[PDB]
Amino acid sequence: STPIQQLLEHFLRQLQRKDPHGFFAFPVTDAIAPGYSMIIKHPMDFGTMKDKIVANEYKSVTEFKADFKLMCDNAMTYNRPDTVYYKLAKKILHAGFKMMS
Numbered sequence: 001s002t003p004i005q006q007l008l009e010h011f012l013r014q015l016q017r018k019d020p021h022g023f024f025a026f027p028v029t030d031a032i033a034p035g036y037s038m039i040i041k042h043p044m045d046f047g048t049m050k051d052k053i054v055a056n057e058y059k060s061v062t063e064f065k066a067d068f069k070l071m072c073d074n075a076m077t078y079n080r081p082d083t084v085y086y087k088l089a090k091k092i093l094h095a096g097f098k099m100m101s
């Protein structure tokens with residue numbers, strides 16, 4: 001495929017280019033981030049977003065943007081400001097929203 005799926009796949013590709021290490025590529029595990037699942041109630045990541053596009057679960061660009069923001073907000077909640085994940089989350093949140101509008 002639908003027009004929305006095509007546009008969201010385009011946005012997702014452009015967003016993932018901003019995360020060359022793939023920190024946001026897959027769900028965060030508790031092994032990597034102790035206690036993550038007990039702190040972050042609604043996890044999100046680019047891989048889950050891709051699966052949601054393919055399953056045609058996004059019906060508006062607004063919904064896709066909300067998942068993107070949720071992913072970045074989670075990183076700015078779990079991690080301290082002086083960490084690579086917090087800094088990257090903040091950077092891509094702002095650049096991603098601009099790129100998408």
Ligand SMILES: CN(C)C(=O)c1cccc(-c2cn(C)c(=O)c3[nH]ccc23)c1
Nearest residue numbers: 021023024028032033074075078079085
């Ligand atoms: C060297 N490492 C640990 C990694 O390449 C790697 C791998 C997988 C996940 C993450 C990670 C991602 N995000 C979004 C976090 O908020 C976070 N906090 C602590 C780790 C992470 C880091």
